[PDB]
A paper describes a structure:
All three toxins have the same amino acid sequence in the primary binding site, and they have essentially identical 3D structures. pLTB forms crystals under a wider range of conditions than CTB, and the R13H mutation makes the primary binding site identical to that of CTB. The toxin complex with inhibitor 3 was solved to a resolution of 1.6 Å in space group P212121 with one B-pentamer in the asymmetric unit. The inhibitor was present in all five binding sites, and binds in the same manner as 2, with the galactose residue binding to Glu51, Gln61, Asn90 and Lys91, and the sialic acid residue interacting with Glu11 and His13. The benzylamido extension, the feature distinguishing this inhibitor from 2, is flexible and sometimes adopts different conformations. Interestingly, in two of the binding sites, the inhibitor is stretched out and links two adjacent toxin pentamers. In these two cases, the sialic acid moiety extends into the sialic acid binding site of another B-pentamer, creating a cross-over with another ligand. The inhibitor solution was a mixture of two stereoisomers, as indicated by the waved line in Fig. 1. Hence, our data show that the presence of inhibitor 3 shifted the equilibrium towards CTB-dimers (“decamers”). The small increase in oligomerization in solution (20%) measured with SAXS is likely not sufficient to be medically relevant, and the stronger cross-linking effect in cristallo was probably selected for by crystallization.
CT and LT, with their five equivalent binding subunits, are known to be multivalent proteins. Binding has been described as a “two-fingered grip”, provided by the two terminal residues, galactose (Gal) and sialic acid (NeuAc). The specificity of this interaction is mainly determined by the terminal galactose residue, which is buried in a deep pocket at the rugged underside of the toxin (distant from the A-subunit). As expected, all three inhibitors bind in the primary binding site, acting as decoys for the toxins’ main receptor, the GM1 ganglioside.
Residue numbers in the entry:
A (entry chain E), B (entry chain D), C (entry chain C), D (entry chain B), E (entry chain A): 1 to 103
Write the structure that this text describes.
Amino acid sequence: APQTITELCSEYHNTQIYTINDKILSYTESMAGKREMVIITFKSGETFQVEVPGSQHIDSQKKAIERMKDTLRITYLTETKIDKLCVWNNKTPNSIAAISMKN
Amino acid sequence: APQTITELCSEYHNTQIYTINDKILSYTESMAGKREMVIITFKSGETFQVEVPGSQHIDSQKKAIERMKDTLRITYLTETKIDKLCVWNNKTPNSIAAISMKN
Amino acid sequence: APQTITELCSEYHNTQIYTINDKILSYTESMAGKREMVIITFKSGETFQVEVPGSQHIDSQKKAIERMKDTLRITYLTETKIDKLCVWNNKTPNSIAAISMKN
Amino acid sequence: APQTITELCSEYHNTQIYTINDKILSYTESMAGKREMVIITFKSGETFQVEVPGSQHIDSQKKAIERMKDTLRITYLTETKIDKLCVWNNKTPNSIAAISMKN
Amino acid sequence: APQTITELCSEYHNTQIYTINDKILSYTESMAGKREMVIITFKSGETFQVEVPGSQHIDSQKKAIERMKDTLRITYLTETKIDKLCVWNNKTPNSIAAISMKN
Ligand SMILES: CC(=O)N[C@H]1[C@H]([C@H](O)[C@H](O)CO)O[C@](C(=O)O)(n2cc(C[C@@H](NC(=O)Cc3ccccc3)C(=O)NCC[C@@H]3O[C@H](CO)[C@H](O)[C@H](O)[C@H]3O)nn2)C[C@@H]1O
Ligand SMILES: CC(=O)N[C@H]1[C@H]([C@H](O)[C@H](O)CO)O[C@](C(=O)O)(n2cc(C[C@H](NC(=O)Cc3ccccc3)C(=O)NCC[C@@H]3O[C@H](CO)[C@H](O)[C@H](O)[C@H]3O)nn2)C[C@@H]1O
Ligand SMILES: CC(=O)N[C@H]1[C@H]([C@H](O)[C@H](O)CO)O[C@](C(=O)O)(n2cc(C[C@H](NC(=O)Cc3ccccc3)C(=O)NCC[C@@H]3O[C@H](CO)[C@H](O)[C@H](O)[C@H]3O)nn2)C[C@@H]1O
Ligand SMILES: CC(=O)N[C@H]1[C@H]([C@H](O)[C@H](O)CO)O[C@](C(=O)O)(n2cc(C[C@H](NC(=O)Cc3ccccc3)C(=O)NCC[C@@H]3O[C@H](CO)[C@H](O)[C@H](O)[C@H]3O)nn2)C[C@@H]1O
Ligand SMILES: CC(=O)N[C@H]1[C@H]([C@H](O)[C@H](O)CO)O[C@](C(=O)O)(n2cc(C[C@H](NC(=O)Cc3ccccc3)C(=O)NCC[C@@H]3O[C@H](CO)[C@H](O)[C@H](O)[C@H]3O)nn2)C[C@@H]1O
């Protein structure tokens, strides 16, 4: 298996690593139907989403999507600094695949 | 997908944005049958609910309804400031569709 | 829908509001079979339970029962003050239907 | 229903009450197959388990077993004092049936 | 059942104990498909994973794998010191079977 977020992100088409080194500026959460998603921003001006579950996802991703949203909320609430994100850049806003945090 | 709560809120009939910019004043949670709901209030005087799950909800909202109740509880307990709420205004109290918070 | 815990509680037979205005004194949790329950006490002397799930509970209550127990544990550990409880008084200890907290 | 952990514990065969009045000393958690369990210890020298789910458990205990482990982890991480444990003493280490804590 | 992490770790082939005695340096979490996993590092330079659920796992492990990832996240955010890890050493990074923490 991969040993770092970069190694992992490189295993996928249409991804890139963003170097964030910052806490989340804003957290947005929706339970509106067809828009069950989370959006985060940073003071850098970047916006990212956890996508609505959809037919591009495989069954093993369902719990992982929910875990990612849980991680983003508690990261936000604790002002925990994020190191890097692995995103898919064929979505607007870019779509989160992985997160790393360092202390 | 949308990039802000206001953009997302505009994709729905019977909504409006409330700019709260405050912590939650009170949190009420019920497990009584047919009233399995959360109610929050603000010192502004506004009251909002997460509705009981019903026939208007689609299957993709079931986990999101539970997540939103989770977010309101921890928001209340940590005195985290809410920025905006997207609410459905065809319910009393108005019904939460989305939340945003910024720091 | 109701806008306060008192309005809500008044929708049911065999209920009453306790105005506690205090943190939980003790928290007890059991996973013993047929006693899968939580019991809380207050220094004023009151003792309340979240009942074991049973045939009096409708399906929509199953998640809500689990949520209430979640809520009681984190309220206890954070020494958060409970304002009101709505309880059923046809069970001993009286059984929690809803809780409110204000800050 | 019972009003105290000791009343509850007395309904069961093969149990006893340990009065600990202390934080947990160590927390061990395993996801190794057939050993999906938590082990806690205390400075007084006692070791206790939450048992692996098994054919001795009834279905209502499955969510309760998971809750108990949730509770032991957060209790460990917060240094929260445990007051009493009701344990089954026909297992080695003795097996947790209920827990209480007071503030 | 076992009473220590070491005793438990010895009930499996392809395992060893690492004595960490340290908090987690980095936390990495992925929802990318077929890489739904968590990776941790320490300032020692070791790296460990919770593996993607796979056909080597038995059904009783599915909730435990999710629990272990929950534990690692909160352990990381709280700066909690880990005492030992039991890991499978036939994977790269080595794969977490059990964790212990003492205070
Ligand atoms: C406490 C206990 O019950 N311990 C036993 C342990 C568990 O039953 C088992 O690990 C749970 O699945 O199974 C042990 C163990 O050492 O892991 N075990 C497992 C095995 C099966 C063996 N392989 C198969 O079943 C595939 C196979 C199919 C057909 C024919 C031949 C091979 C096996 O090693 N299973 C565990 C594999 C490990 O899974 C781990 C996660 O659970 C990690 O991912 C490891 O990296 C991986 O090697 N045999 N013995 C024997 C231990 O004494
Ligand atoms: C580690 C690993 O397994 N990585 C592999 C990766 C995963 O297997 C896959 O993403 C898991 O679902 O699958 C890779 C990938 O880069 O994502 N992949 C996937 C695909 C095709 C595949 N397209 C289809 O299955 C539609 C299709 C159906 C029938 C016939 C033809 C097309 C595809 O790109 N799937 C991922 C789509 C991405 O999903 C993401 C969420 O998981 C995001 O939403 C992205 O914005 C979206 O592009 N091509 N390469 C190749 C890569 O090696
Ligand atoms: C982003 C997106 O997909 N937005 C679309 C939105 C969603 O598809 C829909 O809300 C998702 O369920 O559906 C829109 C909308 O504005 O909500 N839509 C939907 C409808 C009719 C549709 N009527 C039915 O589902 C029948 C029905 C009514 C009541 C009970 C049981 C069954 C309807 O308004 N659905 C939403 C109802 C609202 O649900 C909300 C919870 O999700 C709140 O409870 C509201 O108070 C309630 O009005 N008209 N417009 C159009 C909008 O474009
Ligand atoms: C054709 C038709 O519509 N028939 C319906 C029937 C009639 O409307 C009713 O019988 C007319 O009086 O009403 C039915 C019925 O089963 O009688 N009905 C009745 C109820 C009220 C419903 N009865 C049950 O949930 C079943 C039950 C109660 C107690 C012990 C064990 C099981 C009721 O009052 N539940 C609340 C009971 C309270 O539950 C609380 C937890 O939620 C606390 O534990 C309280 O301590 C407890 O008193 N809900 N549905 C449903 C049935 O479908
Ligand atoms: C006519 C009659 O009532 N016969 C019944 C019989 C008697 O009630 C019993 O022998 C009288 O003492 O008790 C029977 C028996 O076979 O002896 N019995 C006894 C038990 C053990 C019994 N099981 C149940 O009560 C659940 C259950 C109910 C109904 C059917 C099956 C399971 C029991 O001792 N459960 C607790 C075991 C403890 O579980 C704990 C966790 O929950 C810990 O792990 C403890 O270490 C463990 O000892 N299971 N079946 C079933 C039998 O049908």
